[PDB]
Design a protein around this ligand. Structure first.
Ligand SMILES: CCCCCCCCCCCCC/C=C\[C@H](O)[C@H](N)CO
Ligand SMILES: CCCCCCCCCCCCC/C=C\[C@H](O)[C@H](N)CO
Lengths: 297, 97, 245, 48, 245, 297, 49
């Protein structure tokens, strides 16, 4: 029941996203047209204004004398599908016999793919990502030796009970997904869906997850997105007793059906911690290498 | 609808039936507090006593609206009025009505 | 018909005589949330003029040895106006923004500022310098309000990412020979259709002098920079008591 | 939270105290996702 | 199908099992201001759910020797919620109301209350008793907030006008044998389409026991009365800093 | 541009005033129909609920056995036109020769019609009134003697300069309206429009006109509507010298084209002041007279 | 007391907006809830004991 003119003539409730742009097919590189000399006034395609924040709309047809070039170079290798569907190391778990880390035949590894710099920097180019994945578990001895041993790879989502030992009752995998493998067999390989409560993962969360006063005590919460905590990956030696082969499981993740939003500046400083864009402020390095003089190369 | 046991105060054996109903006496009329409970089904609290709170343990993510039904188990000549509020997130424990 | 602009929204109006143009962020205009995309069933309040209007935060002085400043959004407007009360009284929030930065100087001054919008500008620490400590930034520095916070290491934007590649986000440049304003229109950017204004900050606004200010003495040595910003297409939902943090 | 709006009024003879029974459910728009194994029940081993 | 009611507005809901009916004041429903009737050119903010919802003020105890209470509108809601901030932040105001008064008691209690809406309930003074002093009432007593003020001389309603003829205004009667609620829906009443909520009060809400409460000891001696009220069709206009009084 | 359903299905902006009622013509009193005995169940037209706040919809056709009466009694004398178009005293000004009130040949009288109880109580039955008026000035000597004297009746609206004496320069009435009369002639009589900035006068203003803190110092502002302050009526003896006839001007106001809103309880206590509903709390009187016993008349 | 459950809605109890729910009910089926291989037995064939 709308009667006044201040609500009939309104734009409130306009859910349609008005865009200035339009994605057009670019299967090949842009071709070049033939260009001649211009000796005129008024039109100046070389003078720009970067103050507008836009980029140069210039060409080489407008700036030099060019020939017709038919470009048959494909733009198919710069897709996200090709750039990210390359299995990289995201984790590495050791099941030693003795020591300090995991001397009791089991190990839990909380999923963060931000422990090795090669795959981190490649995903931290973007702010939001939505992808399926394919994990692959390459288990072996420190020496690389392959051994006849049976393992159990359990996925423990959030809320589910983490196993406290090797003979714990969570390994029964009644509703949790698990995988059994021999190491004499090939590496395991499972495909995974997009499992977050949000429409995408996000490697940078500018804010705090919990309400309340924010003191120096619980300051470690800054940047923690629980929409990214997909849980825990556990691994044991299937048995009632101690094994005799030390083991190392390496995890290799490959994305599929990738979508990404909001590119960022790529990191030029060295990572130091996980899920934390900290740096060494004493040893700041330039993102390039130096000269001695600007006139001499 | 199954029984959401708000009065999860007792611990001994005989008083485990006290845990399914919370009392309503006469007060001084200053808008006092009767009871409070979180609206989180998968969290450890009153909802563990519900089928919703036990099936949601077998799942990791949930979405949708909830119902809470309160039934008065008093005399026919008894009468009163209560305010059952849902405080969305951010809201601390209210100190007053 | 490009160097002049009148930005009128609500009961406010900004005139400019030395503009460049208006940047629309990622090619999307601010909008309201669809019924496809929404999940919360509550009916949101859409106050159309009491919060969609220009607010004016404070002034920062561009001196010779200035390094830069950042302002986190929507932390700038949580203690200011009818916007900052609804944000307290509600749990959710959804708005775009029109940011406007003013820096006026003569035709005998020179300098350049980069005015960039970086989403999810997470802040880093110097790790004690050595790189051994997993230190974390305080609340004063993460969310500093409308008085902003100054950068210590502006080459890396205090997050380990270089200033050079920041022009892949939204940006305009305030060149004192060419312009004295910078208009950026930002949509709502989040993985979620709604989020809380008091815990999550959607983006940061960086103001960095790439070229140092220079003038000969005799001129005016005080060159302020003022941030002026309007919410757009604002929406609120989930009503309870007012909480500040 | 549950607050006394007015009071619990009672005549002579009727009992001065009652009880309320809460009954919780969900609605037609409720959905669950990503099946796991439950955590708020555990078991002492050695069944039989 | 008359003694039960569910009043749903916004994120609030009042159920009643012992209602009489709903009174609509002067036969008009609350509404918004036309373009014919309006004069101010500003576009008003119409927040539809954050202020149009039920608020609950405080409780008054009906004792044997109770005389009556009054609550002035919209003074009740100027320090309460998103309504009372917009009223501070704005200069004008226009809303109807749905008042709801609750008083529950047994089938062995007895009594009656008159619940009346008197527009422009100007308050008088006893003139020192003698009638010589042109005294004036204080601000505590003229506009007493949500804790209300009690009547000293309820026969004349503390204005020289008799309680008997107050049923020419809106009213319902809370007879504890018959009902425990009273719903009155009030439109906006003024000579002007808009007015300020902090200086002008549009009407007063009188609650007067015409019949004294009686019960035999053994029963519950504490019988509260709670006022529960919703703005309806609210409108605000003229935005400036927040002022309390 | 409305797209969501939460704004298409809205009632916001509904300016039409939805009324439950309808004014129908009632030129005469309601006629009576013939009624008989009823000896049935279910229908009980005598049992009511005043708790609803409404009035009894009963009849005498439903409660006794009646005859057909054709009522030819008119409802034309209870109109506001007839009830208020009766000229009553609203003011009385004295222009004595000596004394304390007005010994200098001029007198200003700020317009309030709330100085005599007979016309006040009749307008204070309502809360809002919108009317034209007709003022009438009956000037004479204290003894009632008529004398050959010329007067000037100036209307001084708000903002306009009040005259400080008889020979003041505001009496020139260049834009202000004035009236000259002899007292040997009939009473003056001018018609007046509705002159307020609001849509109606209001005899009760529940609030303060000025912003700011409200202390005991400026507490006299409570109830003051400046939308009712139509100004000042001044009167002098036209001359450069002192008169010799003492004078009293009486003002008699009559409404026309009356409209009124929101009836109120009529006052039963005695007025004490102007624009102030104060009473003597010691001597509270009932609005009727008493008996000694309820069973004996 | 009837033993049935509440037929109420949020459309009847608060002021709501049009939400188009695209959440699937396909994971609460018995097919999905039970087709998950779990331990039901464990047999030991020792040498001695
Ligand atoms: C049988 C074993 C299957 C194991 C399946 C593991 C599920 C993992 C899903 C991929 C999660 C994406 C990466 C997670 C988010 C980010 O790296 C961090 N949590 C946030 O910095
Ligand atoms: C040549 C002389 C003409 C005099 C005309 C006088 C104009 C008066 C217009 C009628 C005003 C209505 C009465 C005024 C309002 C109320 O009585 C009080 N001011 C408020 O209590």
């Amino acid at each position: 029941g709308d009667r006044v003119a201040d609500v009939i003539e309104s734009s409130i409730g306009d859910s349609v996203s008005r865009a200035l742009t339009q994605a057009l097919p670019a299967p090949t590189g842009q071709n070049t047209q033939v260009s001649s000399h211009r000796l005129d006034t008024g039109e100046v395609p070389a003078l720009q204004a970067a103050e507008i924040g836009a980029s140069s709309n210039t060409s080489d047809e407008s700036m030099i004398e060019t020939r017709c070039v038919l470009n048959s170079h494909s733009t198919a290798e710069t897709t996200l599908d090709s750039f990210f569907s390359r299995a990289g190391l995201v984790g590495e778990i050791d099941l030693p016999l003795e020591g300090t880390t995991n001397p009791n035949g089991y190990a839990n590894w909380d999923i963060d793919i931000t422990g090795y710099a090669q795959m981190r920097r490649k995903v931290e180019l973007f702010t939001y990502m939505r992808f399926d994945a394919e994990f692959t578990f390459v288990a072996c001895t420190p020496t690389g030796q392959v051994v006849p041993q049976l393992l159990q790879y359990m996925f423990v989502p959030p809320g589910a009970p983490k196993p406290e030992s090797r003979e714990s009752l969570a390994w029964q995998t009644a509703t949790n997904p698990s995988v059994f493998v021999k190491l004499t067999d090939p590496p395991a390989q499972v495909s995974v869906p997009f499992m977050s409560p949000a429409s995408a993962y996000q490697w940078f969360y500018d804010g705090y997850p919990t309400f309340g006063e924010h003191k120096q005590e619980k300051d470690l919460e800054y940047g923690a997105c629980p929409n990214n905590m997909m849980g825990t990956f556990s691994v044991r030696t299937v048995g009632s007793s101690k094994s005799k082969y030390p083991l190392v499981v390496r995890i290799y993740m490959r994305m599929k059906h990738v979508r990404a939003w909001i590119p960022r500046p790529m990191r030029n400083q060295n990572y130091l911690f996980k899920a934390n864009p900290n740096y060494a402020g004493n040893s700041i390095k330039p993102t390039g290498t130096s000269r001695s003089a600007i006139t001499t190369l | 609808e199954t029984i959401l046991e708000v009065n999860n105060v007792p611990t001994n054996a005989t008083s485990l039936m006290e845990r399914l109903r919370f009392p309503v006496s006469a007060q001084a009329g200053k808008g006092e507090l009767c009871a409070v409970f979180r609206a989180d089904p998968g969290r450890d609290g009153p909802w563990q006593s519900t089928m919703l709170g036990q099936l949601c343990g077998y799942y990791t993510q949930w979405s949708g609206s909830l119902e809470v039904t309160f039934m008065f188990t008093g005399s026919f000549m008894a009468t009163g009025k209560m305010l059952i509020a849902y405080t969305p997130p951010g809201g601390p424990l209210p100190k007053d009505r | 018909s490009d160097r002049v602009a009148q930005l009128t929204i609500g009961n406010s109006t900004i005139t400019t005589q030395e503009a460049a143009n208006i940047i629309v962020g990622y090619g999307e205009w601010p909008s309201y949330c669809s019924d496809d995309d929404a999940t919360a069933v509550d009916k949101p309040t859409r106050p159309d003029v009491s919060v969609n209007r220009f607010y004016t935060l404070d002034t920062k002085l561009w001196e010779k040895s200035s390094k830069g400043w950042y302002w986190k959004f929507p932390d700038v407007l949580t203690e200011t106006g009818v916007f900052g009360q609804n944000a307290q009284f509600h749990y959710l929030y959804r708005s775009g923004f029109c940011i406007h930065v003013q820096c006026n100087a003569s035709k005998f001054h020179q300098g350049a500022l980069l005015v960039a919008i970086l989403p999810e500008y997470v802040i880093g620490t110097v790790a004690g310098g050595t790189g051994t400590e997993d230190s974390h930034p305080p609340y004063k520095q993460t969310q500093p309000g409308a008085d902003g916070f100054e950068l210590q290491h502006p080459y890396v934007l205090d997050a380990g990412i270089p200033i050079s590649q920041l022009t892949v986000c939204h940006h305009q440049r305030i060149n004192l020979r060419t312009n004295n304003c910078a208009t950026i229109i930002v949509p709502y950017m989040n993985t979620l259709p709604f989020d809380s204004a008091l815990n999550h900050c959607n983006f940061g606004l960086l103001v960095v002098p790439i070229s140092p200010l220079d003038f000969d003495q005799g001129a005016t040595p005080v060159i302020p920079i003022t941030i002026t910003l309007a919410p757009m297409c604002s929406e609120f939902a989930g009503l309870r008591q007012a909480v500040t943090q | 939270s549950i607050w006394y709006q007015t009071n619990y009024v009672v005549p002579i003879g009727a009992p001065n105290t009652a009880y309320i029974i809460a009954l919780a459910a969900a609605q037609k728009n409720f959905t669950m996702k990503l099946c796991k194994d439950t955590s708020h029940i555990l078991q002492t081993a050695s069944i039989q």
